[PDB]
Design a protein around this ligand. Structure first.
Ligand SMILES: NC(=O)c1cc(O)c[n+]([C@@H]2O[C@H](COP(=O)(O)OP(=O)(O)OC[C@H]3O[C@@H](n4cnc5c(N)ncnc54)[C@H](OP(=O)(O)O)[C@@H]3O)[C@@H](O)[C@H]2O)c1
Ligand SMILES: NC(=O)c1cc(O)c[n+]([C@@H]2O[C@H](COP(=O)(O)OP(=O)(O)OC[C@H]3O[C@@H](n4cnc5c(N)ncnc54)[C@H](OP(=O)(O)O)[C@@H]3O)[C@@H](O)[C@H]2O)c1
Ligand SMILES: NC(=O)c1cc(O)c[n+]([C@@H]2O[C@H](COP(=O)(O)OP(=O)(O)OC[C@H]3O[C@@H](n4cnc5c(N)ncnc54)[C@H](OP(=O)(O)O)[C@@H]3O)[C@@H](O)[C@H]2O)c1
Ligand SMILES: NC(=O)c1cc(O)c[n+]([C@@H]2O[C@H](COP(=O)(O)OP(=O)(O)OC[C@H]3O[C@@H](n4cnc5c(N)ncnc54)[C@H](OP(=O)(O)O)[C@@H]3O)[C@@H](O)[C@H]2O)c1
Lengths: 234, 234, 234, 234
C-alpha cells in the first residue's frame, strides 16, 4: 500500500496523474482550490479503482494552506510515498506588458508553491525514501518570447528541485518537463487537437505511472516529453 | 508489427532493452561485435518471447560496417520503428594521461558511431515516424574528474542527437541519460551491488519499454535516471 | 557624452562599477536605499573624475520606487546608454529552514527588481541601442547547498535577461556572473582576503569597464569570472 | 615580461589576439600551418610593437606536430603565461550530408587539437599560474541547423575545457565564445560587413586583451559575445 499526494489535482495533468496512480492502487491525497472537482474525482476513483482518496482545499500560494493541507494528509494516511507538486499557471505577455500581479501569482504558485509543498512533506518523504515529482515545463531549460515571467519561474523551480535533491539525498526528486499539454493551462480549455502541438494529460500520466513502477532504488530525475506536433526547440 | 534495431546489444543496457522490447513483441535487429553473444540472445528471445530476431556483426567505429548492417536490417525487415544507438565505452584518466588511442576510440563509438547509426536508418525512421533512442549518459550535461575524454564525447552526442531532431522533425529522438549502471562498462563486469551506486540494466530497460508504449505522437526527448546510491550531482 | 544608471550603487560591485565608469567619463545615475552613501560617492566622483552624477533613493523591491527613480533619471539626463541592474542579496540556509520573508526578499530584489529596472529604462535603451548589464552570479547556472533560495532567483534572473534580449533585439543585454566577491553580500563586510576565495569589486568593475569600451555593435552577452581561490565548480 | 602562445595565429581571431597582446608587450609564440603568414605577422609585430616573436609550423590535428611545437616554444622562452588554443574550423551541412572526412577534421582540430595544445603546455601553465584561453563558439552551448558536426565538437571542447579546469585548479581556463566573426571561417574571406551579423576579430581581441590585464588571481571562465546584427539565439 502506497500513498501519493497530488497538488493541482482538480484538472489537467494533476488529475490525470491521480487517475493513473489510482489504476496502480495508490491511496491518494488530492489538493487544489476547486474542492467540488476534487470531491467528484475522489468519489469516482474510490468506487471504480477501489483506492482510498482523501481530498482537501489547497491554495499553494498560501503558506498556512499548505501547512494545514499537509497536516491533514499526514494525519489521514501517515507517511507519504509520492508527492506530486504539480499546481502551476502561466500568463504570456512581453515582459514590459506583464503585470506585477501576474508575475507575483506565477512566482507564488510555480516556485514558492512547489517549495512549500515539498518542504511540508519533506520529513515524511525522507522516512519513506519517497519520490517528489515536480511538474515544471520543457521551458525550465529554454526560453520563449512572451514567456519571460512563466519561464523565469520554471527555471527557478528547476533550481529549487535540484537543490532540494542535493540537500536531501535520501529522497528522490523527479522533474517532469512537459511541453504544451491540452489542459486549461494558459486560459484555455481541454479539447485542443494533438495536431496543433499538444500532449494529452493521460499520456503524461501514463509516462509517470509507468516510471513510478520502477524499484525504489531507481531515481528518475528528469523526463522531458513533447508532442511530435510541437516544434523541437531547445 | 514493429521493428527495433539495437546497437551494443551483446550485453549491458542494450541487451536489457532488447529483452524488454521482446516482452512487448517487437521484432529485433541486434548489432555488436560479439556475434556469439547476439546469437545466444537471439535464439532465446525467439523461443521464449516468440519474436523475430535478426542479428549481424556491427562495429560502429567503421563506416562500412554500419552501412552493411543497416542494409541487411532493412532488407530483412523493411522499415524500422525504433533505433537504439546504445553502443558506447569509457576510459577514465586525467586528461593529460588519456592516450590518443583511448580518446579516438571513445570518439568513434560514442559520437561518430551514434552519428553513423542514426544516419543509416534516418530515411526509414522518417517514413515510419519512428523513434531513435541514444544512450548517452547523465554526464552528457555535467562534468566529472577523470572523465574528460568520455564526457566530452557524451556532450558531443547530446548536441548531435538534438541537431538530428531539429533537422528531422518527422522523427522522434530520445536521449537516454543513465548514471552508473552495473554492466561491463569502464572495464568492469556485472554483479556490482546497487548499493555501491549502480542501476541495473533491466531497470533502465523497463523505463525504456514502458515509455515506448506511449502513443506515436508522444516524443520523449530526455530521460535522466540514476541509482539512489549514486550521489546526486549536476 | 554617455549616461550609465547603476542600481545597488551604494557599495560593493555597483559602487565599483560606478567608479570605473566614472574613470571613462560616463555621466552616472546612482540608485540604492542608502542615500547617504550615494551622496558621498557622487560628490567624490564629480570632483575627482569630473563627471556628472545624479543620485536618488531606489528600493527595487517596490514598483513605485523604481518608476519614480527612472522618471527622475530620464528627466535629469535624457536617454540612458547603460543600465546596470546590480542590486541583489542572498540568504543561505537549507531550503526547509529558509523563511518566507527571506525567500520573498530575494525574489523581490534579485528577480522582480531586475525586471522593474530593465522595464523602466527599456524604451530609452531601445532608442540609444544601449546596454543593460545584470549582475546575476555564477550560480545563475549551477547549484550550491544552502543556496536554494538565492540560486533559484538567479536562475530566474538569467531566464529574465535572456528573454528581455529575445524580445528586444535592438538592446544589448549582458549577464555578469561573478563568483564570491569581497563585499557586504551574505551579511558580511569588505576586507576578506582574496585567498579565502574572493574577487574584489574593483576587479569585476575593471572587467566591466573595459568590455564597455567595445564598439556599440558588439553585444557582450555573458561573462563569468571567479577568484583562482574559489574552487572551479559547475 | 609575459609569454603568450597562440594557435591558429595565421589569420582571423588568433592573429587579432596576437596583435592585441603584442600591444601590451607580450612575447609571442605563434603556430599555424601557414608559416609564411606567421613570419609576416611576426616581423611586423617585432618591429612595430617591439616584442619578441617566435613562430613555428603547427598542425594541431597531429600529435607529433603539437609536441614538437611546444618543445620548441618552451625551449625558446621558458615557461609560458598564456596559451590561446584558437585553431578551429567548420563545415556546415545537414548531418546525413556531412562526410566522414569533414567530421573527422573538425574533431581533430576543434576538440583533439585543443586537448593536445593544452596538455602540451599544461605543466608550464601550472608553474606560472597561467591562463589557457580556448576559442570555442557561442554554439558550444546551443544548436543550429546544418551545424551538427561543428556544434558537437564545440560542445565537446567546452566539456574538455571545464574538465581541464576541474583537474587543474592551479591554472586558469577561459572559454571564449564568439558568435559569427568576419574571418576565413566557414570557407569565407574577411571583408564581410558588421551589418550582415559579424563581429570583427580586432573587437574580440580587444575583449581578450583587456580581460587579460586583470590581476593573476582573477579567473575569467567564460565570455560570450556576438554582433548586435546576429539574432540573439540560445
Ligand atoms: N498544459 C501545458 O501546456 C503546460 C505546459 C508546460 O510546459 C507546463 N505545464 C505545467 O503543468 C502543471 C499543471 O498544469 P496543467 O494541468 O497543464 O494546467 P491546468 O489545467 O490549468 O491545471 C492547473 C492545476 O493547478 C492548480 N492550481 C493553480 N493555482 C493553484 C493554487 N494557487 N493552489 C493550488 N492549486 C492551484 C489548478 O487547480 P485549482 O486550484 O482547482 O484551480 C489546476 O488543478 C503546471 O505546473 C503547469 O505550469 C503545463
Ligand atoms: N554502465 C555505465 O556505468 C554507464 C553509465 C552511463 O552514464 C552511460 N552508459 C552508456 O550506456 C551505453 C551502453 O553501455 P553499457 O551497457 O553500460 O556497457 P557495456 O556492458 O560495456 O556494453 C557496451 C556495449 O557496446 C558495444 N560496443 C562497444 N564498442 C562497439 C563497437 N565499436 N561497435 C559496436 N558495438 C560496440 C558492446 O558490444 P561488443 O561490440 O559486443 O563489445 C556492448 O554491447 C554506452 O553508450 C555507455 O556509454 C553506461
Ligand atoms: N558578493 C558576492 O559574493 C556575490 C556573488 C555573486 O555570485 C553574485 N553577487 C551579486 O552581486 C550583486 C551586487 O551585490 P554585492 O555588491 O556583492 O553585495 P552588497 O555589498 O551587499 O551590495 C548589494 C547592493 O545592492 C543594494 N540593494 C539591496 N537591496 C536593494 C533594494 N531593495 N533596492 C535597491 N538596492 C538594493 C544595496 O544597497 P542599499 O539599498 O543601499 O542597501 C547594495 O548597494 C548582487 O546582485 C549579488 O547577488 C554577489
Ligand atoms: N569566425 C567565426 O564565424 C567563428 C564563429 C564561432 O562561433 C567560432 N569560431 C572559432 O574561432 C576560432 C578561430 O577561427 P576564425 O579566426 O574565425 O577562422 P579562420 O579565419 O578560418 O582561422 C582559423 C585559424 O585556425 C588555424 N587552423 C586550422 N586548422 C589548423 C590546424 N590543423 N592546425 C593549426 N592551425 C589550424 C588556421 O591556420 P592555418 O593552419 O594557417 O590554416 C587559422 O589561423 C576557431 O576555433 C573557430 O571555430 C569562429
Amino acid at each position: 500500500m502506497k500513498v501519493a499526494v497530488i497538488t493541482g489535482a482538480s484538472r489537467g495533468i494533476g488529475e490525470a496523474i491521480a487517475r493513473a496512480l489510482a489504476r496502480d492502487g495508490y491511496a491518494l491525497a488530492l489538493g487544489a482550490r476547486s474542492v467540488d472537482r476534487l470531491e467528484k474525482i475522489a468519489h469516482e476513483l474510490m468506487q471504480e479503482q477501489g483506492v482510498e482518496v482523501f481530498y482537501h482545499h489547497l491554495d499553494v500560494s498560501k503558506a498556512e494552506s499548505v501547512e494545514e493541507f499537509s497536516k491533514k494528509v499526514l494525519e489521514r494516511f501517515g507517511d507519504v510515498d509520492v508527492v506530486v507538486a504539480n499546481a502551476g499557471l502561466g500568463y504570456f505577455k512581453r515582459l514590459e506588458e506583464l503585470s506585477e500581479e501576474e508575475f507575483h501569482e506565477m512566482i507564488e504558485v510555480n516556485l514558492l508553491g512547489v517549495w512549500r509543498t515539498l518542504k511540508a512533506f519533506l520529513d515524511s518523504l525522507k522516512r519513506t525514501g519517497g519520490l517528489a515529482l515536480v511538474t515544471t515545463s520543457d521551458v525550465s531549460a529554454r526560453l520563449i518570447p512572451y514567456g519571460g515571467g512563466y519561464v523565469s519561474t520554471k527555471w527557478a523551480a528547476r533550481a529549487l528541485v535540484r537543490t532540494f535533491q542535493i540537500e536531501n539525498p535520501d529522497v528522490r526528486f523527479f522533474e517532469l518537463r512537459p511541453g504544451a499539454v491540452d489542459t486549461y493551462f494558459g486560459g484555455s480549455k481541454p479539447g485542443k487537437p494533438k495536431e496543433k502541438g499538444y500532449l494529452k494529460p493521460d499520456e503524461i500520466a501514463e509516462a509517470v505511472r509507468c516510471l513510478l513502477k520502477l524499484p525504489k532504488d531507481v531515481r528518475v530525475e528528469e523526463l522531458m516529453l513533447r508532442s511530435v506536433y510541437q516544434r523541437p526547440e531547445y
